[PDB]
Amino acid sequence: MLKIIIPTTMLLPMTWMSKHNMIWINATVHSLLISLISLSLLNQLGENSLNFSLTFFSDSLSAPLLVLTTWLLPLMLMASQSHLSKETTTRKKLYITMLILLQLFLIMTFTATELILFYILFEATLVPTLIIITRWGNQTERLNAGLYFLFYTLAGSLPLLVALVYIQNTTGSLNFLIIHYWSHPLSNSWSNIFMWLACIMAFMVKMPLYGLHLWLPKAHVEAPIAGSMVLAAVLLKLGGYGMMRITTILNPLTNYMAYPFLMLSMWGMIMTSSICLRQTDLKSLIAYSSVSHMALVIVAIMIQTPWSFMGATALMIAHGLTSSMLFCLANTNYERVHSRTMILARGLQTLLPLMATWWLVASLTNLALPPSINLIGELFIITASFSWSNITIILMGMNMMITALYSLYMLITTQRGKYTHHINNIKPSFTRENALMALHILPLLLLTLNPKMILGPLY
Amino acid sequence: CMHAFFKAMLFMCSGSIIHSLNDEQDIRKMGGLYKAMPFTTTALIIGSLALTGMPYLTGFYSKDLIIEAVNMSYTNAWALLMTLIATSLTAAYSTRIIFFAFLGKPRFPPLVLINENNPLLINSIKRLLIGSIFAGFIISNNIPPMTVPNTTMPLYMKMTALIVT
Amino acid sequence: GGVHIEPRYRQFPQLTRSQLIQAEFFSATMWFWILWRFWHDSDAVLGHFPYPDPSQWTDEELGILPDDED
Amino acid sequence: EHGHSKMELPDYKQWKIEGTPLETVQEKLAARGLRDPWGRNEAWRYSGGFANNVSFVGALLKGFKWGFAAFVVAVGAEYYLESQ
Amino acid sequence: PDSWDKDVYPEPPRRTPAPAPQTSLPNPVTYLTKIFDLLVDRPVTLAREFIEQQHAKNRYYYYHREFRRVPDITECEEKDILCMFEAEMQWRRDYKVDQEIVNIIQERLKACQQREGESYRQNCAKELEQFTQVSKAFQDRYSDLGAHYSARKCLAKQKQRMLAERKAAKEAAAA
Amino acid sequence: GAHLARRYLGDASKEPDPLRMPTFPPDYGFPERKEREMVATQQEMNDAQLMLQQRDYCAHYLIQLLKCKRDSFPNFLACKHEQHDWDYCEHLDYVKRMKEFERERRLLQRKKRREQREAEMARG
Amino acid sequence: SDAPPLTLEAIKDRVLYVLKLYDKIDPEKLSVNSHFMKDLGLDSLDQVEIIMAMEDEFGFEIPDIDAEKLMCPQEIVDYIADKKDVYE
Amino acid sequence: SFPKYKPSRLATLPATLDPAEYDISPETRKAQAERLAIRSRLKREYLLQYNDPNRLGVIEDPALIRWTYARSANIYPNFRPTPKTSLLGALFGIGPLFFWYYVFKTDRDKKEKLIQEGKLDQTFNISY
Amino acid sequence: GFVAFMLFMFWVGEIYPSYQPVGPKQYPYNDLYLERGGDPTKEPEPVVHYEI
Amino acid sequence: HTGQEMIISNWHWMTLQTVELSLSFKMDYFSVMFIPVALFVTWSIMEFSMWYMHS
């Protein structure tokens, strides 16, 4: 596993010893090379795992997430190349350093043979994100947003740590293999109820669960483009990965402790979706869409069936890619208009047709159009929930409809109609933005050919 | 299969009329077109006659059997009543279309630009014309049997579709 | 790829003999087909098998006793 | 290749209310004491090829004569070759 | 085709009728298929023969991996992690084999319904019965284990089912 | 249908109900009671795989129709005779069913008449 | 489409043509620069009817505010030309 | 006389049917004049900014900024805990959750009871 | 009113169906017992039909 | 001519435990009857659209 970690660490000295006008080129090239290297993790077995060492192990649940995390960095570099043009060389190198540190922390988080190491890295990913949000942000609200994005997360994660050490004092080990093999049922008790709550809320606060989601719109809107990228793509999936790993020991309590949360998700996926219908901001709409998708993922995980797990994994991967693309498109519009309001710039399809094509493809993919992996995950989760209960489909059906509506609403308000008359600074789209959108969208349509790569360990 | 042919032909005829009439869709400004444009006129008459199930046309070989099977079956009486009234209203709206857009004195603006002399339009219309005329017979007689026929009927129940039409 | 036709401005637009003869031919073909199908296949509309009268059936084949035996 | 032939507007004095239903409209209006100032404006709708009309039955029976003639010829040929 | 076993995937003799032309008029189907043969099948056959001779010029073999048998979960100590590891891997392999057996029976059933055509309900009874039996056995073995399934949970399910059956049989005998 | 009007506006018990028909034994009328004859055996009717709804007593004529349709394929109006034969057999089946309906109706008529006569005699 | 590119001469010819069949206006006294209320002595309702006649002739309808202040054939021609973007 | 038209929320009153337009007082005329004066001033400002050759950017609209700010950021500072607000928040945030929980719990309890009784016919139920 | 009247008349027509003065259709081999479902090891009660 | 009917299950997409999803085509009466009619209608509509949408 070190053959991926060491190049990521070497990304930093290369960045800091580069010339003043070659930092982006070297960073992008070597990040792409590291992605090509990390592609080799996709070769998995139907048996236990790829146990490289006592410290790091890989599975068909961790390999797709690692590949996505490693592939995300060059896209963030291309996105951030634009608005950091008038910056000092030292500050640009600091930005790239923060991005590299975040990628390294995520890479070491997704292997994590041990639970305490997983917690340490899962909480270490918090610092570069906060610095990126609060330092290179455009508006005055960013500081407040950062506070939210911090404390919510900590409020969830501090009890979990205690629970973790308690398990080590009772089970004797926190290694995931020993935990899996030596699992024992949880008796129905108040102590076990609170242990379950402590183990679960830490990951539900970062999904985010409905009602604990007020930090996400702030963090997504006030962050720069790379921050929104990494928040919507990878950081949301930490809670999903943690939940799948952690549960193996929460049975059979999860049979009845899931009731308060499933409802909170089953209704929540509706509410946030409806919120998307009445919005005056693109970033807020994308954030609420992400909240709804993660609510469906929460339902999938809490159902605890193999089809649920497969659908959840596919949905996390697809949603990460799609949300990154949507944020990139919104940022490209903002960098021209400088307002971030849906109703100001209209009829951009006439002026920028290829960007309108990218918008249409991103909207269709977010709309869960078959045979995309978005729909694969959605349908697997829906079928598993139907097996859980025949009435759930109703809510799910509703959500689907609402989703499509606001998605096409985003496409119609911004791209369709008559252009704003007084705006005359809409320059033709560069090659950089088009390449960014193409590199975003091609992996989804390629992954739809081989779904078994992203269906998890239960395939 | 039958609806495909005759409805596509009807829509193409309507589109030809709209294009020749300077992108005007209201029938309140379409007058004498039985003589002003002959091919669209005859194609639309053939389409309306096939749609209303004139015997031994494309619509007959399906719609008449539909009416026969619905009447001679264990169903709700309201269902047959609504189906018959719907057939009558189908005849009514076909009559409305033909009467308003062809028979009346022309109501379009003075600058007449009506013309039909384009090979693409004529060929595209005539292919579905021959389809709407002969596809019913050929397809009905060229498929294996798949249901029990209604050999015996009362005289009034056998003629009901024509009566309401 | 048609021919040149000029607007008439409140006069009947020009018509060529080709479209007129084509329309007449197609209408005549439809009506000939209708008449030919009616002649060769008349039982499709009028019916081929007469409908029997249930009241006309004699009671012998109908299996009823003269209201006394059973 | 477009229609640039310098079409000429015909004289304005041809359009007459005589011989059209607008005459009946004028009679009915004068029976009350009025006049239509735009009666001649629409006269071209009844002057040229628009004068003759066609009924619904005639419109449906567009090619009945020639189709009937072809049917009679076909049935005569059929009768003459079958009886052999 | 010899690429698969005819006993694992049985097929009827597939009787086909002989052509019995009643009229002297020539049908277009035989002419069309003759020209299709001449214009498509011969070039494709020649290309396949060339490719097959190229493959025969360079031949090499690959083998099916044989796995030994190890003690199952019923003979493992409490915390003896190595033998539980071996038994768990063996159980997972057996689970995969069971899934593929059910897939084979489902394939047989799907093929039979299509082959039977109109009289499918009566004819496919043999396939349907086999699928019902295999599905019942599979559902008894593996259903309701959960996302975090293991050999221990399957053993517990079997133990509870056997206890229930023993109690029911004892009650019936002592009725 | 007129029977619908007679049942829904007149006496319901006077005329039969198609769902539970027939309500009277087959031998109530006459003891001759010749049985229906089936020509196509199970094996050939299964091999032809017609349909489940076409497996009636008129199946042999359907077999002949399919034989002609498959044999003289391109000239699709050649074998018209077996179509007529199958239609005739279907018509015979339907008039047989109508005869059954009329028999049940008049049987119910005479049964109700017998009950009314017995009640009147008992009263008098 | 196949619609000829109508010109200013065509617009003026059609406008004068339409105004001549208006039997209330004498064709002899009618001119391209003749005022409606004064030179031809027409009422406001007759002006509205003239506007509607032009609307039916040209296939497009003029807004009421713009139509109510068209008092000469020349300015009607100019308004129609500016609407349809006629060069000559 | 003719049948009257009754306006509603989604079908408002026509401008021509309004009683108010017909009755006119001088104060009304002055109000219309000053409304038009304000509109003309705003239009003059917009046209002066719009036609300027040296401008190569977005003409900022204070009204749009005010609308977005009031819709997004001005909600909470003007919020006041009121019986109407408390009742509506409690209802729309608590009632649906309990309703759906009750429905799902009843359905699942019925299903589990039927499963224990053995009369559910789970034949061919393999994937879950 | 239109929707309610349609629903009520649909229910009424359901209560008062339409059919022909005909008996049930008769099928030869024990009401097609073997071909519909099967169970060839049961020997069911034979149903014989009435030729009139 | 005969009543030929076929399924082509050509490409095996994936397998979820005991469920097999593959690229399968059914060539029954409905498919072979609705194929030419749709193709014919689309052909005629495209030929007409060449003229209708010329500008």
Place this chain on the structure above:
Amino acid sequence: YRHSIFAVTHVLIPVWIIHYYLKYHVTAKPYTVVERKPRIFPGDTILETGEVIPLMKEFPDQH
């Protein structure tokens, strides 16, 4: 000539590829291509076995 080149490049090569893939790859696996069993009527003879199906009951005929 345009018609011939279109017919050779747009129909012939795709059908060659498809037929090769179907005959030598798809068919090689079992149950990939399953065809409806051809209908059998009384009186036909079978190519593979050569036996003849017996005729029916010789039921009454008239009209």
Place this chain on the structure above:
Amino acid sequence: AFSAPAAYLTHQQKVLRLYKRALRHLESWCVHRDKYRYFACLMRARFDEHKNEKDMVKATQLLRQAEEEFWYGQHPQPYIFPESPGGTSYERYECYKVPEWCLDDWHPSEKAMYPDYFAKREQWKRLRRESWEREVKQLQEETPPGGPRTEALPPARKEGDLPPLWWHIVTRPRERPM
């Protein structure tokens, strides 16, 4: 649309507008031309009966009942011209309308084609650059204290002067650009 709106509508304007609307809806109701002519003449006769009325109160009482009679019989599906705000082709060609300043972003390879057009465009740009400097001061001098009272602009009064705020009125794309 081209004429600037007024602060209000007088009685005469409202009478004319109701006359126009009633005639249009009558034409929609009376499909054929002769019937429409007859009923339009009858409506005109019914309309000028009160033409010579003098007092304002009764005249305002009229045009009200008339407003109500119009609303009762307003033909819920009236005829609309295709380019009108309710027509089937109201904004059909609005997606082909591209702003002129887009031509400033054309690549030099694209500008190599059509040299004369871009030379004319540069001439127009120079003319606008001088004209705006003149018109801003002309408008400043013209306006009354307290700002404009109507959205009506004055014409040019000098020799080389041009009407103020003309660039975005003259440079409209087209009616049917494509």
